[PDB]
Design an enzyme around this catalytic site. Structure first.
Site, PDB file in Angstrom:
ATOM      1  N   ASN A 161       0.819  -1.227   0.000  1.00 24.60           N
ATOM      2  CA  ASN A 161       0.000   0.000   0.000  1.00 24.60           C
ATOM      3  C   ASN A 161       0.856   1.282   0.000  1.00 24.60           C
ATOM      4  O   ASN A 161       0.323   2.360   0.274  1.00 24.60           O
ATOM      5  CB  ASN A 161      -0.960   0.024   1.194  1.00 24.60           C
ATOM      6  CG  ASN A 161      -1.796  -1.224   1.339  1.00 24.60           C
ATOM      7  OD1 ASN A 161      -1.815  -1.865   2.396  1.00 24.60           O
ATOM      8  ND2 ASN A 161      -2.497  -1.610   0.273  1.00 24.60           N
ATOM      9  N   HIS A 190       3.147   2.259   2.069  1.00 27.47           N
ATOM     10  CA  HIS A 190       3.440   2.734   3.414  1.00 27.47           C
ATOM     11  C   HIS A 190       4.776   2.110   3.822  1.00 27.47           C
ATOM     12  O   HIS A 190       5.085   0.992   3.391  1.00 27.47           O
ATOM     13  CB  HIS A 190       2.353   2.274   4.403  1.00 27.47           C
ATOM     14  CG  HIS A 190       1.072   3.019   4.254  1.00 27.47           C
ATOM     15  ND1 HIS A 190       0.864   4.227   4.896  1.00 27.47           N
ATOM     16  CD2 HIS A 190      -0.013   2.735   3.493  1.00 27.47           C
ATOM     17  CE1 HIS A 190      -0.336   4.642   4.510  1.00 27.47           C
ATOM     18  NE2 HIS A 190      -0.899   3.784   3.656  1.00 27.47           N
ATOM     19  N   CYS A 239       6.393   7.342   9.010  1.00 32.08           N
ATOM     20  CA  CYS A 239       7.365   8.050   8.189  1.00 32.08           C
ATOM     21  C   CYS A 239       6.791   7.943   6.752  1.00 32.08           C
ATOM     22  O   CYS A 239       6.395   6.852   6.319  1.00 32.08           O
ATOM     23  CB  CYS A 239       8.747   7.404   8.301  1.00 32.08           C
ATOM     24  SG  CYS A 239       9.963   7.978   7.075  1.00 32.08           S
TER      25      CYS A 239
END
Ligand SMILES: N#CCC(=O)NC1CCCCC1
Ligand SMILES: N#CCC(=O)NC1CCCCC1
EC number: 3.1.2.14
Lengths: 264, 263
Positions: free
Chosen positions: B185, B187, B222
Site C-alpha cells: 500500500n 506505506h 514516516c
C-alpha cells in the site's frame, strides 16, 4: 530444493511473501533477484561448496561483473515460483550462472536471468584469469554442451552499456546502505545496487509501467560507510533508460546499466 | 502453514535464507520481524480476511502501536524455524497479536513476541476505540481464555519508555526509505523502523553482543518522502534508549529500548 536427475542443475520452489510484493501485489524485481541469489547459494552447497579447494588455498573469490534479468510475468503474493539454475565455464574469462523462472501451476517460463562472474584475490582486489586447476575442479558440476538462458545471437544480455553524461534527467542523491543491506561477510548485497539504480526512475513510470528487462554492470563495490548518487536518463509503448551509480563525493563509478519498461 | 486443530491459532515453518543472515551466520532481528509479519498475514487470510466487514464499510484499519520481541537463540542459515501466532481482543483499547518461535528439530522455544494494535480511520488518521460490532466479529477467531506470549506479572513488554534527551550518545542521520522499504500500500514497512533504530547502535556492540530484547513504540508514520534521524544513549549486559525523529522539525516517529548480552 534439490539437484536434478543428472546432477548438473538445481531446482527450488518459493511461495511469494506478503512483504516481498509491490503496489501491484506481485513480487518486486529485488525479491526475484534475492530468490536467484538463494537458489544460487543452495546449488553451491549441494555440490560440496562458491570457493573451490584451489581458490581457498590462493585467497581467490568469484565476484559479479554483470547481471541481466528479463521478466514476462511477476508472480503474485501467495503464488509458487519454481527456479532452475546451472553454471558454466567461459574459458579463462570467468564463469556464468543462469536461471529460468517458471509458474509452478502452469509450468510456463515467466522469467530468465544470466550473470557473469570474474575471479578476484580477496585481499588485493586484483582481477585475474581462471587457472586450469580451478577450471578443472568446477567442470565436473557444469553441463559440457552449452546451455544458455539467453541463446539468441542478437540478445540484450551481451550489449555494451555506455556511460551516462551529465546532466542526468533524473537523480536520487545521498543513498547509504544500512545493516540489512549487508551480506554475512559485511559486504553490500548485489541486490541493493538494483534497488539504488531503480530509485532514480520517476514514480509515474513505476505506477504505469512494468519492468521487463534490467542489465547491470558492477565496476566497483560500495563500502558500508560510502554514500551513493543514482542517475537516470531516458534513451527512448516502451520506455528505455540509461543508469549510473557513483560515489556522492568524488563521483567514482560503482555501476552502470539499462532498463526496459512496458506500459501496463 | 495451517491453522491448528481448534482453529484458534496458526503455525508456519520457514527455512532461514542466505541473504537473511548477519555476520554470525544467524538470522537478523529484521528477518525474524519479517517472518512474524508473514505468519500474521497468513493467519488473517486463512480465517477470511485484517480488515473485517464493519471495518471496510467504516474506512477503519488496524495499526501497530507497540512491538516487543525477545530472542534466546537466532536460527542459523539453513535451519527450520516454526512460528505459532494468535490474536486476542483487549476490550475497547484494541487488539494484540502474539508469537512463539521454536526450533523445528528440538521443539524448544527460541523466541517470543507480542504486539499491540489500535483502530484508526484510514483517511483522517484519527485513533478510535473498538466498537462492540468489531469485538464480536473478531472474537470467533481468538481464544476465549487469556493466552499470553509474555504472561509474567510486571514483564518487559508493558514497560513505559521515556523520551531520549539531547544530546544523544550516538546518532545516524539522514535515513530515507527506498522502494524496497515500502509495503503493497506504499506505506513504510514496520520492520524498516527496527532497522533504523539499530543503525545508531555502534558496530562494536553488534560485533561483541547479541540482541536479546527490543521494545518499540510507534507514534507516527514516516512518509516515503520523509528523512529520519536515529538517536541512541546507553542507559546501563548493555541497555540502550532509542529515538527516531524527522530530520528537519524533530517530530517524534518512534521510541524504544534494546537489551544486549555479551557473546
Ligand atoms: N552471491 C550470490 C548468489 C548468486 O549466485 N547470484 C546472485 C548474485 C548476483 C545478483 C543476484 C544473484
Ligand atoms: N502488518 C503486519 C503483519 C503482522 O501481523 N505483524 C507485523 C507488524 C509489526 C511488526 C512485525 C509483525
Amino acid at each position: 530444493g534439490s539437484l536434478t536427475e543428472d546432477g548438473l542443475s538445481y531446482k527450488e520452489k518459493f511461495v511469494v511473501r506478503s512483504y516481498e510484493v509491490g503496489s501491484n501485489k506481485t513480487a518486486t524485481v529485488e525479491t526475484i533477484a534475492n530468490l536467484l541469489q538463494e537458489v544460487g547459494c543452495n546449488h553451491a552447497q549441494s555440490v560440496g561448496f562458491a570457493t573451490t579447494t584451489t581458490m581457498r588455498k590462493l585467497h581467490l573469490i568469484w565476484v559479479t561483473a554483470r547481471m541481466h534479468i528479463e521478466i514476462y510475468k511477476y508472480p503474485a503474493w501467495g503464488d509458487v515460483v519454481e527456479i532452475e539454475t546451472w553454471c558454466q565455464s567461459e574459458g579463462r574469462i570467468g564463469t556464468r550462472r543462469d536461471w529460468i523462472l517458471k509458474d509452478s501451476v502452469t509450468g510456463e517460463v515467466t522469467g530468465r536471468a544470466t550473470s557473469k562472474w570474474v575471479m578476484m584475490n580477496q585481499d588485493t582486489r586484483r582481477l585475474q584469469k581462471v587457472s586450469d586447476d580451478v577450471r578443472d575442479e568446477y567442470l565436473v558440476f557444469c553441463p559440457q554442451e552449452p546451455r544458455l538462458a539467453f541463446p539468441e545471437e542478437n540478445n540484450r544480455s551481451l550489449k555494451k552499456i555506455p556511460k551516462l553524461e551529465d546532466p542526468a534527467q533524473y537523480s536520487m542523491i545521498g543513498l547509504k546502505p544500512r545493516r540489512a543491506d549487508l551480506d554475512m561477510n559485511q559486504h553490500v548485497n548485489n541486490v541493493t545496487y538494483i534497488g539504488w539504480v531503480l530509485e532514480s526512475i520517476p514514480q509515474e513510470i513505476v505506477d504505469t509501467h512494468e519492468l521487463q528487462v534490467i542489465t547491470l554492470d558492477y565496476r566497483r563495490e560500495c563500502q558500508q560507510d560510502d554514500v551513493v548518487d543514482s542517475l537516470t536518463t531516458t534513451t527512448s509503448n516502451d520506455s528505455q533508460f540509461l543508469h549510473l551509480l557513483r560515489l556522492s563525493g568524488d563521483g567514482q563509478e560503482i555501476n552502470r546499466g539499462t532498463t526496459l519498461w512496458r506500459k501496463k
